[PDB]
Structure formats: C-alpha cells, structure tokens
Design an enzyme around this catalytic site. Structure first.
Site, PDB file in Angstrom:
ATOM      1  N   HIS F   4       0.794  -1.228   0.000  1.00 47.05           N
ATOM      2  CA  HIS F   4       0.000   0.000   0.000  1.00 47.05           C
ATOM      3  C   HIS F   4       0.826   1.278   0.000  1.00 47.05           C
ATOM      4  CE1 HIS F   4      -1.697  -3.342   2.343  1.00 47.05           C
ATOM      5  NE2 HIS F   4      -2.807  -3.104   1.666  1.00 47.05           N
ATOM      6  N   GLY F  89      -8.732  14.784  12.375  1.00 44.57           N
ATOM      7  CA  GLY F  89      -9.951  14.556  11.623  1.00 44.57           C
ATOM      8  C   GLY F  89     -11.222  15.145  12.188  1.00 44.57           C
ATOM      9  N   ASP F 204     -20.692  17.385  13.809  1.00 41.88           N
ATOM     10  CA  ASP F 204     -22.123  17.299  14.093  1.00 41.88           C
ATOM     11  C   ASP F 204     -22.352  16.545  15.402  1.00 41.88           C
ATOM     12  OD1 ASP F 204     -24.823  17.694  13.759  1.00 41.88           O
ATOM     13  OD2 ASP F 204     -25.050  16.341  12.051  1.00 41.88           O
TER      14      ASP F 204
END
Ligand SMILES: O=c1[nH]cnc2c1ncn2[C@@H]1O[C@H](CO)[C@@H](O)[C@H]1O
Ligand SMILES: O=c1[nH]cnc2c1ncn2[C@@H]1O[C@H](CO)[C@@H](O)[C@H]1O
Ligand SMILES: O=c1[nH]cnc2c1ncn2[C@@H]1O[C@H](CO)[C@@H](O)[C@H]1O
Ligand SMILES: O=c1[nH]cnc2c1ncn2[C@@H]1O[C@H](CO)[C@@H](O)[C@H]1O
Ligand SMILES: O=c1[nH]cnc2c1ncn2[C@@H]1O[C@H](CO)[C@@H](O)[C@H]1O
Ligand SMILES: O=c1[nH]cnc2c1ncn2[C@@H]1O[C@H](CO)[C@@H](O)[C@H]1O
Lengths: 230, 230, 230, 230, 230, 230
Positions: F4, F89, F204
C-alpha cells in the site's frame, strides 16, 4: 509464607471457615473457638486457629468478590495444605419464596464473572460445591433440625448490578440468593483435589426490602457441626 | 399434542426415565416395566408408560445432544405435567481415576454449548442436577450397596471434539465423564419448577481405551429405585 | 465400525440422503428406493442402501440438532468414504413471503450454536452449502419445474427459542426458514473435502400459524434427481 | 448509611485516597494526616478523615479485586458526594524496562474482568484515569522531582493467572504493571461525573523476581501533593 | 446527499461495481465504460456512471475494510436506490490448490470482525452472496469460458494477522482466499432486500509467495457481463 | 516497498499527520507544508512529505475504519521507521455538553470492533493515546490558547449503528465523540514502541443535529505545533 499470609505450613487446620468480614471472622474465633490463636493478619484478614470440640479449626476473612477469595483459597489449598473450606456468610435473596433470615446451602453458584471462562477454555464451568460438603451441611442441618434451603446461588461481580432484568431472570430459574465468592471458590477446590462448600444467611431480599443474630448463630452451628463431620 | 409427541396429557407418568437410544428405551420398558404401553412413537422415539412396583413410570428416548433433549424435556414438563426426569445412559470417562463400567451420578454438568448462555443473559449458568434427585440416586446406590461416583459431568456439543486439550483440562478439574444432554436438561427443570437428574455407566475412557451389562443393569436398579423414592 | 454405525466401509453409497425422523428415512427407502437393504440401525437410526434409477443411494436419519447430525455426518465422510450428503426435511418459515408447504433450498445457514466458533477459532464461519449441491438442487427443481425458494436458513439449538425478538430480526434479514442441522453439516463437508446440501419443505410459519404430502413428495423428487446429477 | 459504610454524608472529604490493605490505610492516616478521625470501620475497612496542609482528606481501604473497589467507589461518589478518588498501592511489574521500587502512574488499565463489558453493552470500554488526576500526579512528581513512569496498567481478576502467556503479551504491548482495581474504578468515576486516578509502587517483577519504604513514601508524597492540587 | 456522497438520487445506476482502490475505479470507468461521468468524488472515492453495451452502470471505490464498504453500500441501497452491487477486486489465496492469478467467485465470506454479531444478536450470521449474483457471475464465466473457482472467502479486519495459525485452519476448511469487505457487504444487501456479489483475482498466496493484467481483465469481463445479465 | 506504499525507507518524516480523507491530506500538504513532495499515492492515499518551521513532516490519508488505518499505521512504524502518528480529523459528538465545532483531544478510545480482543487474548485492551502526544496536544492548545476538550473517544465499526441505545449509554459514561480509527491506531503504536495521538473537530452531534473552517484550522494549528514539540 505468601504475599497475603504470614503463617507457615501447619498453622492452619485442614478445615477452614471463611467469611468476607474480617471482624466477623475474629468474632467467630472468640465466640465459637477454644484457645483461638491469631495465625495471620496480613491486610487485617484476621486468620485464626483454635479448636471446636477438640478438633483443629481455622477461621479467616476472604474479602468481597471472586478475585479476593480466589487468592486466599488457592494459597490455603496449595501452600497450607488445607483440605476443606466452608464459606460462611450473608447473601441477598432472589427467589420470591426465599425470605430474609432464611439459611441457604449452595449446591452450586452461577456468576457474571469471567474467571471460570478463563480457566475453562471459554466454556461453561459449573461452579459446584463439593458433594461431601453439601451433604455434611444438610445432615448437620437435619440433625440440629434447623430449616435450610438447598439450591443454586449466584456470585456477582457487581453488588450494584446495572443489569436490572437479571434479578427477575434468576427468580424464574429459581436461584436462591446472591453473594460474591462461591463461583470462584468451588473450581479452585476442584483443581487442588480438595473440598469447598457454602452456607449463608439471607440479610435482605433484592426484589423487595424486608433476630438477625439467631439466624446467623443457627448458620454457624450448622457449619461448625458439619466441619466436624468432615 | 406436540410436534414431537402424539400422546395426551395424562399418558405419561410424573416420573420419566430417558436415554438417548430409543431401542434402549424400548428394551427398558419390556425388561423392567409391567404392562408397558407405547404412548408415543413420533420419530420412533419409543415413549412408553407402565408401572414399577405398582407405581406409574414412563421411559422414552431423547436423541443425542442438548438441542434434542431440550425439545423433549421442555414438552414433558410443560404439556404433560411431568415432575421428574431421570436421565439414564452411557458416558465417556475423563478423570484418570474413573474407569470403564463405573457408574457416575452427576451433581452438575459443564458444557461447550451456547444454550445456557442464551437463556441466562450470556452469564455462567451452573447446570445443576436437582438436589432431591441426586440424593435419591445416591441413597438408592447406598441401599443397593452399589459403588457409584458422584461429581461433575460435561455435556459436549462435539462427540468428535477438535479441541484435544480440553480432555486434559477436564481431568485436572476432575470432571468425571462426558455425555451430551445433562447441561441442557437441568436448567429446563429449574425453569418449570420441576426436577431432573442423571446417572450414567462409563462405556469407555477418552484418555485411553479400556460385563458391560452388569454395570448397565446395576445403573437401572439405582435409577428405578430412586424413581420410587421420589 | 463406529459407536453409532454397525455397517462397514462400502455398505453406504457415496451419496446419502438424511432426515431427522428415522421413520421418515425408512419410508423414503421403501417408497423411493429399489431393493433397499438395512445397513445400520444402531439407536434405530434406520440407515438403508438401495438404488434409484440404477445408482447406489443410501438414506438414514440424523436425529434433531447440530450435535446429532455432526456425529453422523463426520462418521460418514471419514469412515464410510461418503462424498455427498443431502439433507432432506421440514422447517419453520421465517420470512413473511414464505408460506407453509413452500420448498426451500438453503444456500447457507446461520446458527445460535457455538460449534462453528469452536472449530473456527471463535470467528464467524459461514456455514455454506456446497455450490455443486445447491446447483444440482436448483437445476433439478428447474427441470421438474417445481417452484422452490433459494436462500438463507437458520439452524437453531432451541426449537423453543427464549429470544422471541430473533424471529423478527431474521425476517428483516430475510432468512427463509428454521431447522436444526444445516449449520453443523456444511462445515464438516468442507473439512473432509466432501459435499453437503439441504432442501426442506415448510411445515408451518413461526410468525403466524397457517396437501403436506404433495409438497414433501415434490421435495423428494428434487433431492433424488439432484442426487443423480451429482 | 450504606451496607458497607456506617458514616454519613459529610464525614468523608471530597478527595479520598484508597489502598487495598486496610492496615496501610490506617498507617497512612496516622502517618500523614493531622487529627485523623475514624469515620468508617465496617468490615474493618479503616476509613479515616483528617487534614493535609489544612485541607480535608480521607483515606480508606478498598479490598482486593474489581468487585471490591467497585462497591466502595460507587458508594463514595453516589452517597458521600466524593469528587476525587486516588488509588494508592503496590503492583507487579510487567514491562522488562520497569523494575521493583519504580513508581507508576496509570494513564489507563486493561483487564480480564467482564465488569466493563457488562456495563458497556459487551463492547470495549477503555478504563481511563481522569486526565486531571493523571496531570496532577505527574506535575506533583515533576515538582517533587521524583522519577515516575506513566502508562498502561492491567487489572487482573486472577493474582495467580492460569494464562501464563499473557505476561509476555503484555510486555510486548508495554503494559507497565499489574494490580487489581483500576479498571473497575475508572469507569465508575466516569458514570458519576467524578474523578479517579491511580499511582503504584512496584513491589516485584512477574517476569523475574528481583528500601521498599522510600519508594512507598515517595509515592505517598506524590499522591498527597496531587490531592491538594485537585 | 450523504456525508460521503455528493451525488443525488438517480445519479447512480441500479447496478454498481466497486473496488477498494479509487484509482482502479477511475481506470475501470475510463477503460470499460462509455461516456463515464464523475458523479461523486467526496474523499476522492471516484464514483462514476456511464454505460456498458447501452446499459447504465456505475463504478466507485469503497476503501479497505468492512467498516468502509459498510458505509458506502448502505448509502447506495438506502439513498440512491441501487439494486445490485458487485465487488470487484484482489485477494490473497489461502487454499493450497488456489494460485496467484486465479479468479475466485465468493459464495459467501467468513470474518473475524464483530459487525455481523452486532447486527445479529451475537449469533452466527452467514454472510452469503446473493444467489442471483453468484449465478450471473458463474454463467458469465462459463459463457466467456474463463476458469473461475467458486467458494468461501474470508474478510479479515487484520491484513497483518497476529493469529498466524488461522491461515492453516482456513486451508483445512478450504477457504479460497482473503479480502476485507465481502462479509460486511452481503448482510447489508439482505437488510435492504437488494443484491450483492463478489469476484476477485488472486494477487498472491499467503501460505507461500508466488500477466496480472490478463487475469484482472478477465475478471472485469465476467463482472461486466454478469452485470448485464442482472 | 509495501502493498500500500510505493515510497522507500526515508521518504516519510518521523512524525506523520493522518486523516481519513485523502483530499484533505493533499489540502493540508499544500496549505501548511513547505515544498510538499508526493511520496506515496498508491490507492490515491495522497502521502506527502515536506517541512513545517524547518522540520520534516509527512501527511497522508488512512481511509475510514480500524482495518484501514491499521494497515497504514503498522507499515509506517514497521517499514518506514516512523515514530509519531497524530490522527487529525472529524468526529460526531456524543456527550450533551459537547457541541459541533468543538475540538476534542482523545485520551483513549473505546470500540465495538473485535481487533483489540484478537490481539489481546480476548481481554480488554485500553486503546490509550500516548501520554507524550496527549500532553503535546494539550500544551499546544494551551499555548495557542484554543479551547479543547480532553477525554474518551469511541471508534465505531458502524457509522450507521443498529444499536441505537449505545449513544445514550456513551453519554452517561461521558464519551466525548465518535470516529472510526483511534482504537486501532493506539495499540499498534504500543506494539512498535512508538507513539500515537488523536485530535478531532466535531462536525455534528449524534443525539441532535446542530465557520467549520475556523474550527478545522484551529485544530490543524494544535496538531502542527504539537508535532514540533514532539
Ligand atoms: O445482596 C447481595 N449481593 C452481593 N453480595 C451480598 C449480598 N448480600 C450479602 N452479600 C455478601 O456480602 C458482600 C456484599 O455486601 C459480599 O461479600 C457477599 O458475599
Ligand atoms: O464419550 C462420549 N462423548 C459424548 N457422548 C457420549 C460419550 N459416551 C457416551 N455418550 C452418550 O451417548 C451419545 C454419544 O455416543 C450421547 O448421547 C452421550 O449422551
Ligand atoms: O420450526 C422449526 N424449528 C426448528 N426445527 C424445525 C422446525 N420445523 C421443522 N424443524 C425440523 O424438525 C425438527 C424440529 O421439530 C428439527 O430436526 C428441524 O430440522
Ligand atoms: O503482581 C500483582 N498482581 C496483582 N495484584 C498485585 C500485584 N502486586 C500487587 N498487587 C496489588 O495488591 C493485591 C494483590 O496482592 C491487589 O490488590 C493488587 O492491587
Ligand atoms: O491478502 C490479502 N488480505 C487482505 N486483503 C487483501 C489481500 N489481498 C488483497 N486484498 C484486498 O486489498 C486490500 C488489502 O491490501 C483489501 O481491500 C482487500 O480487499
Ligand atoms: O459521527 C461519526 N461517526 C463515525 N465517524 C465519524 C463521525 N463523524 C466523523 N467521522 C469520521 O469520518 C468518517 C465517518 O464519516 C470516519 O473516518 C470517522 O473518523
């Protein structure tokens, strides 16, 4: 000798009565034993050794919870060569037919602990009281003619149980009462080829809150007499 | 009456002996019962009802495995109002001190099945034989003076167990033998406020392969006599 | 030869049809097979071997529950060198679009049993029917032009399931029906590099109770024809 | 007031230091507190309340094991309105870089107990020490300039752990030491919107057995000073 | 429209091909689709929609792991009214008879993830590929006459699996290969009454390290043709 | 170098910032780094390396879910010799006192994933952020004087969680927010003797839906400054 016991091999009788409350163990030693000698007080556990009707017998606390009694029981069978451990204490009634002050003799004990799954490859280990001990307790009860209920107990890891539905589930399956040590004690006796049993006096009912000395003294008589029979 | 029983309420005695092999149940009915009448043969289960020493008694197969006996036991207590079920059968010795042909009376049974976890909120349910039944079996054994070992059994879901280390683990904890029904039967009796017990004859040893009639007949005597005492 | 089979290697065909009811297996042998010979009746399991359209084929019961069929299936693949086992039986509809008398071909089966977790290091093993068998059953159904539903089945350990919410959960995920063996059978075939499949006729609906011969005979045709194709 | 505490609301300071050994709690009260008054001795738990540098502070035992400390901690936050509980004790080194006598401040604690799974819908609950308490302990350590290791602890249910491979597994993941309470304490503080922390002195190494007062006194200084900062 | 998709209902075809690598999805769209239009690139997922042989078809990445594809699949069936999702990708061979470059069509997928246990009341959910999709893929393979292996796959949560024994266990049970999404995708399709399938090209063997374009192009042909058949 | 990552040892700085969105990682590299060079784009992961205030620093995506970040994190510590990984994040608020746009620094993370149980012998592993990283993030926040909440996070395997009651349970235990990677990242850093941390901006609230740039930019400042301090 061990991290939790200052006594040496031979200081403990082959039969030991244990209760969670160390002060209760001290009371028991002073009240029912003759010439009780303090053989272990590490962590104030109050371990005594004396005689009942001429026979050697020790009494000691084991704290609350499976982890606690697991430490004491394993050390007693392994290091002090103890043969029989009879748990004497209080418990919370579950079954609607069981009431405060009743005396209960556990045939076995269920649990919400993970200890037995850890020692039994994640399977169901039936924490069962030694048949000899159950019999000695029941015969002692019959001879003293003291009413006692015989059946399943439940050893919880949570005195304050978040799972409120468990109580009714146990009533449907007729578990007699709840305490916090039996399920841990029984398998350890099995592993050491030794014996264990438990008898308790109901101090209250968990499905509805409901002299306490008579009941306790009657329980002690049964345990002491049964200890002699063993 | 039920998907697995064509009989009606009253066709079964309040005490029922059960074994996995339906042909063994038929043999038992013809050999030990008087005037045995076939009351259920759905799936060839061979359910009979007759009398032993004048008292009503039924015998029927229950197949192999917890799921199987769970179906039959639950229907008997719920629909046919049966009070006592005594499991009679064979088992595989685990403990090194137990040998082929020995008779074992289960105090309780462990299991690798998930059934009890499903009915007990994923906790440890101790599949315990009813104390009355254990006592009746032991007294019957004492009165007939037939040697019998009393202790833990193990109900496996896998006759051919992939976990080969489990056998030695059970020997260390002193499980007496292995069968495939007890752990399922006991909790069901509890739920219905009824009674259950189990007695088996060791047909072989799992830790080392090792007349079989005498042992079986002696086991039947104990179960039959105990059934009367109950 | 084995503790549950008196037959010897070669007595069983390489393809075996199995159902829980031993009497149904006997009926099937007498009704659909030519020159059926009883090759095993240990525990009255009714194991027969005959021919269908000239080809060798055996039929035998497997009792109820994963533990039961696990014993029989493993012995058949291991000792009797059987190659294909097709489970033929009844089941309880789950999905609201499935009705009594419908024929269901299982692609796979879920379960509340612990058996597969035991053999698969506690992970999720997808009890999957052999693709060859699923195809043979579907083609047989298409050729005979008999409507059949293909999809997930569920093998329960509890005919009388305490978890009443599971039924609706399975309806939401569209499990077609419930039986008690598939989840155990499929993984065993995988382990022996052999094949297994299952086809059932809905005998009732579990979400609402709702000629049964036609449905059963149609199912037998599909299984028998598929057996030939394999 | 409670089944395990005879004191009344207000008898305990808002900050409580706890250790397993009740005799150690008594020693701590007599050694570091001014005007220590015994406020609870049910089960000989030795609960005291006095002052340190003029501020109210209580010390009490909590027994060994998660079940035990869970009872005491929950009662203190719920009934006695305690705000901060700092666990002070001993532990067994795991990590090869940790040695006997080192002081360890737990950021969090892992466990082999089922308690947190029971309260957290069977998921992984990270028993985390309150960040304020961890900081107060580390700053106290920095100000007193006493070397202390900060990291993961492990709360075992089995002092005598059957799973001997776990020790090396924990070394690979760098768990600092093992004790028997933290994992139970931390989640309870969270539930009551209160705070908890833990600091221990290594009494031995479990991977190899290896003045103990200095280490203990240094740990007490850190806990006491941190208690003031909170 | 959703937190991970900027497209609106109607932008996606009813059939969607998905692969972990977003760049592979873009390549596929440019290589096999006509008039491919980028309909979603939130998080660079590369969601396209075009036509294959005149029929609408979308291609998009789904990241690596069950949690990732679970987000995308659920949104596609629920919000974008997608009917069929065919997973196209690479996998690691398990079975000793499977080799690098082979094409595998999953009948179902096992997993070491807890997701299915969470949605299925902690029981065994058989993540099964939709029979229609499996058939369409196999027929496409037969019509194109491209050799393909059909069988069980395994969706791991750990590309770098600590449990090194699992690999051999899966070989014994004949799992064909390992990937990281199927077990999550299949149950979601079931819940939405939709369809899902998976086909992969073996990029290497996990039990022993072992042109890669031909294999990949052949796999794409099978998936594309099967998409048309559906 | 890896399946990867096309980069080679030395292409990545010893400190790497990671976020799920690859496009966000590219934005971060172009916005906050000087001379950012693309060092890895396998699967469009957008791995860059540049400098911040003269010090080497890399940024790269990690996809969504524990399985995804587990692949990237393990490769970075093992192959690229990375020392510190700071997860940057977004997350969903749980606690009623936490609101959209708040910045949260995780002390640890709970999870409903089975990954940690797999690596920790089925016990409770406390996915704990490295204390050094937590401190660096909090000090950075204090120095920049940017309000930030410090506490428990929860890494879910199910963005769309079927268990709707879990949300309120987490509010009672005061979990700050939910994301999908931390619980996987932290244990991996421990295993490699490296470091990991996480800081997120609430996008949120899950218990009630409730400028987003300022919050994100403030979070980046904290992470970047903390990276320098480490
Ligand atoms: O209702 C009860 N639940 C749990 N344990 C009980 C109960 N009643 C008495 N005990 C016993 O005393 C301690 C708990 O206070 C435990 O040691 C238990 O053995
Ligand atoms: O060794 C044994 N393991 C499991 N079950 C046994 C064993 N021996 C006898 N049975 C009994 O007979 C059937 C299995 O053949 C089961 O019904 C079990 O009760
Ligand atoms: O509704 C059902 N639940 C479980 N098993 C069923 C059902 N219907 C048919 N069977 C089948 O017959 C036996 C149970 O009576 C089991 O062997 C099962 O395979
Ligand atoms: O090595 C250890 N394992 C478990 N607990 C320990 C250890 N060392 C100290 N303690 C602490 O003292 C009691 C056990 O003796 C437990 O209360 C634990 O907190
Ligand atoms: O050997 C493998 N194990 C797990 N996943 C694999 C393997 N080979 C290919 N993939 C696939 O590509 C990603 C992992 O690199 C995962 O998305 C999986 O679907
Ligand atoms: O509410 C949330 N639940 C789970 N993950 C969230 C949430 N909010 C932000 N993320 C983050 O973004 C992705 C999910 O969209 C995941 O990568 C998670 O880290």
């Amino acid at each position: 000798a061990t991290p939790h016991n200052s006594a040496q091999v031979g200081d403990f009788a082959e039969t030991v009565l244990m209760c969670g409350d160390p002060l209760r163990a001290k009371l028991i030693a002073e009240t029912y034993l003759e010439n009780p000698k303090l053989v272990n007080n590490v962590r104030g556990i109050q371990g005594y050794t004396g005689t009942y009707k001429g026979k050697p017998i020790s009494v000691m606390g084991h704290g609350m919870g499976l982890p606690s009694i697991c430490i004491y029981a394993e050390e007693l069978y392994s290091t002090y060569k103890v043969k029989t451990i009879i748990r004497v204490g209080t418990c919370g009634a579950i079954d609607m037919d069981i009431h405060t002050r009743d005396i209960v003799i556990f045939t076995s004990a269920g649990t919400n602990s993970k200890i037995n799954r850890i020692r039994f490859m994640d399977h169901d280990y039936p924490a069962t009281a030694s048949f000899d001990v159950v019999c000695a307790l029941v015969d002692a009860a019959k001879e003293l003619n003291i009413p006692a209920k015989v059946g399943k107990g439940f050893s919880t890891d949570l005195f304050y149980n978040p799972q409120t539905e468990l109580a009714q589930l146990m009533n449907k399956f007729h578990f007699l009462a709840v305490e916090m040590e039996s399920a841990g004690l029984f398998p350890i006796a099995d592993l050491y080829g030794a014996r264990a049993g438990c008898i308790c006096t109901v101090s209250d009912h968990i499905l509805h809150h409901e002299e306490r000395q008579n009941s306790f003294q009657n329980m002690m008589k049964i345990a002491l007499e049964a200890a002699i029979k063993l």
